[PDB]
């Protein structure tokens, strides 16, 4: 969606925006699995487990 310049990270030293980004990806990844199980109409047990 958005392209940000890496060069604004090092001198600014606001490293949190990197970690959040990683964490954000991880968060989306979890949703990307759950959404999949919702489109395949998986059992409630599998969604419970995941």
């Amino acid at each position: 969606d958005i392209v940000l310049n890496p060069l604004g990270v090092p001198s600014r030293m606001n490293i949190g925006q990197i970690l959040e980004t990683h964490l954000g990806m991880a968060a989306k990844g979890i949703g990307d699995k759950i959404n999949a199980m919702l489109k395949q109409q998986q059992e409630v047990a599998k969604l419970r487990e995941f």
Binding site: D1, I2, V3, L4, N5, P6, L7, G8, V9, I18, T21, G24, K28
Partner: protein, 49 residues
């Protein structure tokens, strides 16, 4: 705000000096479209005439 899929990479100078490159899908989905309400007043007074 909104959750945006973001990549950290230079793109042909369009992210130079803190500039931001935004995909047209962000515009299409109205992710950052905002409503602004302004109040206009029309006053009818007494004048000398």
């Amino acid at each position: 705000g909104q959750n945006m899929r973001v990549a950290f990479m230079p793109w042909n100078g369009y992210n130079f000096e803190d500039s931001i490159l935004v995909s047209e899908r962000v515009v299409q989905e109205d992710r950052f479209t905002t409503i602004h309400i302004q109040e206009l007043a029309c006053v009818s007074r007494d004048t000398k005439l």
